[PDB]
Design a protein around this ligand. Structure first.
Ligand SMILES: C[C@]1(c2cccc(-c3cccnc3)c2)NC(N)=C(c2ccccc2)N1
Length: 375
């Protein structure tokens, strides 16, 4: 099971995340699992629920071992309660291996499972520092590297309208041009540093620590580009100014309401490009990733609205720092090089573009009067 067989192993409908097929237990029970770089638990629905098509049945697995420890994970609004154990885990369209890993068997949940997402669990790919109940609960990826010869690296190619998760290597057929690396600041979330933000090449002209208040992360489990209050307001002001030929409700800018245009007439040209400059591997060198409106204006698939093309503004205000979500990752080949504590970005085969503009990864960029951009 090489990278060739790993290509196109991801699915997922707009705004509901990307999932990979996995097996838990012996005989293997097949489930769809959300690929999440923003969390560190492997947590699977293990009891019936209105939104679950299937769930993990521990009584049917002869390899299951109960850890006699509970886990309670509350979020902003949603939450899940579970029971810890271990069992045999495999990724049928990933590395040709089966490992023993920690599993949080979800017995109760509230606003966690999404109606029609098609996933029954979450694969948290981030570090042990943020694992629940504590850092002593070894994440799946750490177990995989420990128990197999798989190199300490994975890559994500998320595509808009599926994609690929490549474990253990870089698949050179999934990207064009250069791979540019940003250092992983701290191993907890995939924490990175944004050194500059431009909107249609116009610098937001803020102290770069503002872009990373209190952290900046690469999160496949978050849909939007989430921005700290001060940065979000200036980005919205710039986007509204550039798109002034059309006026949208306040609701649109709050990411709550749809903006629709008759099929094939979306005025892409009126919306600006967002450039996120990421800290390079060498002092005061950086590179940028360019985000087109085809990424930040997320299409909302609905048969009832299908005579038009409708979208949600996929940029939102955050109080927990910058979040480079799925809309940001889409179109790029993102390398999570845990072995070298770095994240690589390159233009992917499924990048967004039109006749005038294209998603890009460019560098190097030099700054001479640069402070440290982190908090
Ligand atoms: C656990 C979950 C999560 C749990 C359940 C569903 C999702 C989800 C929802 C919509 C699309 N994709 C994934 C995410 N995964 C991630 N990354 C977050 C998170 C959100 C904001 C900041 C930091 C972390 N929440």
């Amino acid at each position: 099971g090489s990278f060739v067989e790993m290509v196109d192993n991801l699915r997922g409908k707009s705004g509901q995340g990307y999932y990979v097929e996995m097996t838990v237990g012996s005989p293997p029970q097949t489930l769809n699992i959300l690929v999440d770089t923003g969390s560190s638990n492997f947590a699977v629905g293990a009891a019936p629920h209105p939104f679950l098509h299937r769930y993990y049945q521990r009584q049917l697995s002869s390899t299951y071992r109960d850890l006699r420890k509970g886990v309670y994970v509350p979020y902003t609004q949603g939450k899940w309660e579970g029971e810890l154990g271990t069992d045999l885990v495999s990724i049928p369209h990933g590395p040709n291996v089966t490992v023993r890993a920690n599993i949080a068997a979800i017995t109760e949940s509230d606003k966690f499972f999404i109606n029609g997402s098609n996933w029954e669990g979450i694969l948290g790919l981030a570090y042990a520092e943020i694992a629940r109940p504590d850092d002593s609960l070894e994440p799946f990826f750490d177990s995989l590297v420990k128990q197999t010869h798989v190199p300490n690296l994975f890559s994500l190619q998320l595509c808009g309208a599926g994609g690929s998760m490549i474990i253990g290597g870089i698949d050179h057929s999934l990207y064009t041009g250069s791979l540019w690396y940003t250092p992983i600041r701290r191993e907890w979330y995939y924490e990175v540093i944004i050194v500059r933000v431009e909107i249609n090449g116009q610098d937001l002209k803020m102290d770069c620590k503002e872009y990373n208040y209190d952290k900046s992360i690469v999160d496949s489990g978050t849909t939007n580009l989430r921005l700290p209050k001060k940065v979000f307001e200036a980005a919205v002001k710039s986007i509204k100014a550039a798109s002034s030929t059309e006026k949208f409700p306040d609701g649109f800018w709050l990411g709550e309401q749809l903006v629709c245009w008759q099929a094939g007439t979306t005025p892409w040209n009126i919306f600006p490009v967002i450039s996120l400059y990421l800290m390079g591997e060498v002092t005061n060198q950086s590179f940028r990733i360019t985000i087109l409106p085809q990424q930040y204006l997320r299409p909302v698939e609905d048969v009832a609205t299908s005579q038009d093309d409708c979208y949600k503004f996929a940029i939102s205000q955050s109080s927990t720092g910058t979040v480079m979500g799925a809309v940001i990752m889409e179109g790029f080949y993102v390398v999570f090089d845990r072995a070298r504590k770095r994240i690589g970005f390159a233009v992917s085969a499924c990048h967004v573009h039109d006749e005038f503009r294209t998603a890009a990864v460019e560098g190097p960029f030099v700054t001479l009067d640069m402070e440290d951009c982190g908090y």
